[PDB]
Design a protein around this ligand. Sequence first.
Ligand SMILES: c1cc2c(ncc3ncn(C4CCNCC4)c32)[nH]1
Length: 290
Amino acid sequence: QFEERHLKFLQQLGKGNFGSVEMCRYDPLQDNTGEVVAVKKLQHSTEEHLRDFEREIEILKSLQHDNIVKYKGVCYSAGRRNLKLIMEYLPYGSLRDYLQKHKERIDHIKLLQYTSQICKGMEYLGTKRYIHRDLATRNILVENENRVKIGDFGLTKVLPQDKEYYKVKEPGESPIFWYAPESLTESKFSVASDVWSFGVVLYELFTYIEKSKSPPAEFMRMIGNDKQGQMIVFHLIELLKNNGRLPRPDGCPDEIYMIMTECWNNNVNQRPSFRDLALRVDQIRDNMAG
Ligand SMILES: c1cc2c(ncc3ncn(C4CCNCC4)c32)[nH]1
């Protein structure tokens, strides 16, 4: 129930293939005492893209969890229906940027804490048969030193009643370096495809986001940087098909790297569950404690 006139633009928080997110202050009193919120809108507003957004809004409105970014509401001139999603604003921003800025403060124990939180949110999603389909550190938000949330659901899809995967091919650019093989080859997205991406997220975390060590770089290094266009995808597939994998990050413990590789099983059903992951991560943490 947000009125556009009282939305004061502060800054840009991010961009998407066809969306963006702004930091705004909602100040109806025009006394500058309103809260600061996050606003997502569309850049390309095709009837198709609207359908998706409306669905994204529904999905988010339907989620209630400590590790999921809070839906605050919607706004639209009515008007040509210039739809806008209002979410809570997280002051520490994306886990990706945070992690980078504070590598010196954040130890492995702490990475495991966030890791575990992510699993709990992912598990909550799978509960509603939602496939996230864009798991990444950019897309995790930091609410405070001790808590993260999943903060974007632009690509999230709901599973059909009678199937455990969803087939979908997206126009233009895909985060292929986070994509599971069946996603690359069949455009198949399942909880298990989400676990594959989680593995990469875990990887991201333990690279502390050093640029030379990113998935795209590490894979391109592995494929050879002469590759371009479609060819990149094709080599990527061949590479994974032959058990090529991202390397253990500098300083990563073997037990942690093992979790990553279990996530990066070619064999879809041999990938762990989010509940399993959380338990194993938590067990590990406990062992770190003493
Ligand atoms: C909602 C998003 C959101 C937020 N609060 C702070 C954020 N910083 C970056 N983001 C991005 C925007 C681009 N997509 C990933 C999240 C933030 N609240």
